[PDB]
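Bench log, entry 3. Co-assembly request; chain sequences pasted below exactly as received.
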Amino acid sequence: TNLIAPGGAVDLIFAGTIESEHQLALAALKRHDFMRSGLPDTIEQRGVGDTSVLTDYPYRDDGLK
Amino acid sequence: NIPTLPQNDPRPEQRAQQLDKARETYKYADLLPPLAFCEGVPKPDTPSAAWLVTVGKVAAAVALNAVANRRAWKRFDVGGTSEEDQNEAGHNSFLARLENDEPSVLDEVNERVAAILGAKPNRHVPPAVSKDGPNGRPQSMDDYANLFRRITLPPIASTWKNDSAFAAYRVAGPNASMIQRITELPDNFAVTDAHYKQAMGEGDSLDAAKAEGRLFLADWKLIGETLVNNTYKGAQKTVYAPLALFAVPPGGGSLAPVAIQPGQTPSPTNKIYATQDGNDWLAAKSAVQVAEGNYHELVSHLGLTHLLLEPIVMATYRQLAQHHPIYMLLIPHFEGTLSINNSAATNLIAPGGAVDLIFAGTIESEHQLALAALKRHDFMRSGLPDTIEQRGVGDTSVLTDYPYRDDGLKIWANIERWVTAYVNNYYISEANVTQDTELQAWAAVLSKPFAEGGVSGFGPIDTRAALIFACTKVIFTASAEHSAVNFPQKDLMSYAPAITGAGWTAAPPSQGPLKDFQPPLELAELQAEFLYLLGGVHHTKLGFYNSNSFPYRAWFKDPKITAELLPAFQRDLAASEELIVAANATRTFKYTYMIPSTIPMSINI
Amino acid sequence: IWANIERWVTAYVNNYYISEANVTQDTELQAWAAVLSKPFAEGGVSGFGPIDTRAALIFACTKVI
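Structure output for the full assembly:
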């Protein structure tokens, strides 16, 4: 009712039309796979799993524990 | 005439008197410890003449291959031995043409087989290690394929290195009952996600293959529990006890290898090898092939077909009468079963024989490999539809390519339909079962403990369904199961580099040139010539019941079976032929072993 | 004519090359690709590399044919 609403802070500060921003969010909610969206699942989906190659990745390392 | 149960028989006393004369013809001997065995070959169970001529033709090619090999090595004595073999081929063609005492067939055919399976020298010439023949160490890998001079080199010799050919062995090879689906990994075989993605790519995950049931492990642990490495002419023969994981692509597909750990215990000396490891991977598969070579020859083949049937052949001759209907069902499936086993226990798996030389273990360690698999057998839980489910290899969608399963299940189904119609025609009540003093005597000897000579897990034969399974299984492991293990010897095992009984360098961690891992030349020719002979004789055919006499006239006499039951059996086997052949053509690795027209009635070689 | 030649090369290559490891481990094809991947001044074909895929070999055999 305020943020993603017409005349809200997202309407002014962000480059898109407020209704094109809603399509962006709804597009990702529509493309998700809730059953295959676990963190350890996505980490090997993206091949970012090797800690001896990409050694500095605090989100992956801190997030898996 | 028409068979009848003992309690229903019109003439019980005369039936009892042939049984007593039978138990004198067939008395037990201890040729192989803890096993019920035949005291030689009783005269009725001599190999028939057609079996000898069939064998004789192949036994001549093996010797002719040996002579042509001996002309090439050291590039009239080597010609005289040829002409006698060529004349022996003339003997088999014309002298045996009338088919009506035994001359060529009696001595030569049985002796030439004895010299081959007995690893005896001088197998070059009859009624007339040698540095005059292929021997020692290989100059190059060519010399192994150059052995096949008068016999045909197998096709696998040009395909064995491909990983897909290595995995075809586990589902369409000599031992195709090996794999088992797993939902989690063993503690002693912790393959990583990296190894699985090497084989499958970046479209799958190991934790997802164990989820969707697409992992399949094959163990050789029993080889380590049992064998002891022997030395041949000083040289060290080695065999491991590997652990091999396989996996199928997602949504369906065929088997594909993943990882191999040559030993049961993880160690610094023993570690996992994977698809992209180059030479060590090839020697990791070859070390597996040595294990399957020992496993197949003494567990799948001689253990769980030959030696499992030897007691059932004996108890049938001694407790069932020649007028018993089940005697009428099972006996023709035992043609040549007693004779080849005697030639096996006194020559093949005998000290000084082929197995002791070519294969890695001491021959006494090899016998203990067979007995351990015989001791853990559960006869009542060894049905092909039962063993398939036990290993989780049942879903046609997940694992699509399993020729031993999909072709074998049509053959097992055909036999059950035939046994059931047979058992139900003669056994018309469950009292007919329990009141059969002969069948229950038959059961007592086989239900006996393994230490006394029984068949492990055979109890109890109290229902018509218990007789149907026991009779269906016996016929399967005499016809289809023996076909799927005996005849792959010629097609898939005559090439020692593709597979043999011994790795001759120590380790899967590659030590250098591949030629040093293979067996010597004298043994390699012996492996090629003796696996050719045992795997190259198709005599007698499942569904056609005849005698072992010259007319080979039909064995059944009851008109209910002559003009009705057996014709129905023969029709369903012909339907399986069209179904197997059609599906088999689309494949690029072939399974003729469950093709009904090539399936024998009995274990005869 | 190009479509006919590609289909027949895609058939030929795929009958003998069943694994992408059959391509890399074909030492003769790799030594065949070397003398052709050489610099043009040294005597090579300009732009012949790399031939590491069943696809890449199918193109090379289609163009040459």
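The longest helix of chain A spans residues 18-31. Chains A and C do not touch (no CB pair under 8 Å).
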